[PDB]
Design an enzyme around this catalytic site. Structure first.
Site, PDB file in Angstrom:
ATOM      1  N   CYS A 188     -52.143  60.255 -39.635  1.00  0.00           N
ATOM      2  CA  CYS A 188     -52.309  59.442 -40.864  1.00  0.00           C
ATOM      3  C   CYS A 188     -52.805  60.298 -42.042  1.00  0.00           C
ATOM      4  O   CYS A 188     -52.367  60.137 -43.160  1.00  0.00           O
ATOM      5  CB  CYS A 188     -53.308  58.228 -40.646  1.00  0.00           C
ATOM      6  N   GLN A 189     -53.695  61.225 -41.748  1.00  0.00           N
ATOM      7  CA  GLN A 189     -54.272  62.030 -42.748  1.00  0.00           C
ATOM      8  C   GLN A 189     -53.180  62.900 -43.386  1.00  0.00           C
ATOM      9  O   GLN A 189     -53.054  62.961 -44.553  1.00  0.00           O
ATOM     10  CB  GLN A 189     -55.413  62.865 -42.160  1.00  0.00           C
TER      11      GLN A 189
END
EC number: 1.11.1.29
Lengths: 154, 153
Positions: free
Chosen positions: B46-47
């Site tokens: 996600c990052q």
């Protein structure tokens, strides 16, 4: 409504911030358990309450007592918060099903989707001996927690 | 479960990281919208995806396009992550009801209680014109997002 003194504390198995399973019944016959429900990680009042628990941890986590903080956040949220705040006690995820343990203790805010500021002390028999529920905008007095814990050592 | 291209995009009203209400319908007639669903704040894949989006923001947030990232996390979680990560685009909370929008788009993992890595482009009419979900190991191809968006102008 909130469970009051004299009730059996509903059992639960939740993930802590490191994804380990923590079960309330595991303390039975060994330690009195302080359950500190809280609304949301990374908010100001929650920060202050759990900073104060951190600062006085030996009063809450010792041979007679254990402390468990519970909120609807998932473990990665509680892990980052714990790391950034220096919290070494367990933060438990009532995440999915959402707020199911909160709901069982009668401290879930059904409108907001978060636990209220519910606090309980569970004795070595699994019976609730201290119960309170403040709203999200209020602050708890932790001297009440230590006093309840103290009364169940002697 | 995932809605396919040609479907009308379910409308939503969700809180962003600053507690402001954002509604999909508010872009109708004005902008194409990229909806980036993601499982959990403060996780690695996600990052990286959202860092790519930050780094290419003018391709996604301009006169023709808007980008909204959506997960089950509540606004304070998204606020701290966004601030720490330099995300100046909206992160929206599908928090309570838990994953209701994610469910409506067919990108909700019922077992885990999180959104899957689904992506949609919604046109100025509110129709889904691109729908993507990658394998568990795989990071999404954002050149593809900008290509889909580019086709709609």
């Amino acid at each position: 409504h909130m469970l009051n003194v004299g009730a059996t504390a509903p059992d639960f198995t939740l993930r802590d911030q490191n994804q380990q399973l923590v079960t309330l019944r595991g303390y039975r016959g060994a330690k009195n358990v302080l359950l500190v429900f809280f609304p949301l990680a990374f908010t100001g009042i929650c920060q202050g309450e759990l900073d104060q628990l951190r600062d006085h941890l030996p009063e809450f986590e010792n041979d007679d007592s254990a402390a468990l903080a519970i909120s609807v956040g998932p473990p990665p949220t509680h892990k980052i918060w714990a790391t950034q705040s220096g919290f070494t006690f367990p933060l438990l995820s009532d995440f999915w099903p959402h707020g199911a343990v909160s709901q069982a203790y009668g401290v879930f805010n059904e409108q907001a989707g978060i636990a209220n500021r519910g606090t309980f002390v569970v004795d070595r028999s699994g019976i609730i001996r201290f119960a309170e529920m403040k709203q999200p905008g209020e602050v708890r007095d932790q001297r009440l927690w230590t006093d309840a814990l103290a009364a169940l050592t002697a």
